[PDB]
DNA sequence: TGAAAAGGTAAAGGAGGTCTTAAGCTCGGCTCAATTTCTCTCTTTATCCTGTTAGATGGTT
C-alpha cells in the first residue's frame, strides 16, 4: 500500500508483457481492419447525418451483426 | 382781519449720463505651401496543423 503515484503506474505497466515482432504484425493487420471499418462507418455517418446503428453498419459490410460485432471487438 | 405756515413755480447751477472723434491695436480671412489621416492594395509574416521508419521498452533525489 504505497502512497507514490508514479511507482504505482510503473507497477501497473510492469503487469504487461512486451510484444514480439510477429505479435506486432498480427496486431497490425487487425488494427488496419478496424481502421477500414471505421472509415466505412464514417461514410455512413456522412450519409445518415447520424451515428449508424450496429445493424446499419453491419448491413453496410454485408456482414451478420454477430460476425461484424466480433470483428469490431477483436480490432 | 391779520397772520402764521404750508405749498407752489420759475430759475442757476451742478451732477450725471450719453454721445462724438484721433491713435492705436489685433484679429480674422484669404491664400497657399506644407504637410498628417485614410483607404485601397499587396505583401508578409504569425499561428496552427500533419508527418518522421535501423533499434530502442519501469525514476532521482
Sequential DSSP letters for A30-67: HHHHHHHHHHHHHHHHHHHSSPPPHHHHHHHTT--HHH
Cell of A31: 488494427
CB atoms within 10 A of CB A49: 6
Give strand letter and number of the nucleotide nearest A19 (CA to C1').
B57
Where does A49-75 have alpha helices with state H? 54-60, 65-74
Q: What is the largest CA-CA distance in chain A?
A: 53
Query: Taking a C-beta distance cutoff of 8 angstroms, is the pair A68, A54 a contact?
Result: yes
**Quick one: resolution in A?**
3.7
Give A7 CA → B3 C1' in Å. Answer: 145
Q: How was this structure determined?
A: cryo-EM
Residues A37, A75 contacting (CB under 8 angstroms): yes
Nearest nucleotide, CA A8 to C1': B58
The set of residues, in sequence order, having a beta carbon less than 8 Å from that of A55 and lying 6+ positions away, is A65
Amino acid at each position: 500500500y504505497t502512497e507514490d503515484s508514479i511507482r504505482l503506474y510503473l507497477q501497473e505497466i510492469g503487469r504487461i508483457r512486451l510484444l514480439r515482432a510477429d505479435e506486432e504484425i498480427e496486431l497490425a493487420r487487425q488494427i488496419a481492419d478496424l481502421l477500414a471499418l471505421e472509415r466505412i462507418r464514417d461514410e455512413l455517418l456522412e450519409q445518415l447525418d447520424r451515428l449508424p446503428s450496429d445493424a446499419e453498419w453491419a448491413a453496410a459490410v454485408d456482414s451478420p451483426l454477430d460476425e461484424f460485432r466480433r470483428r469490431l471487438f477483436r480490432g
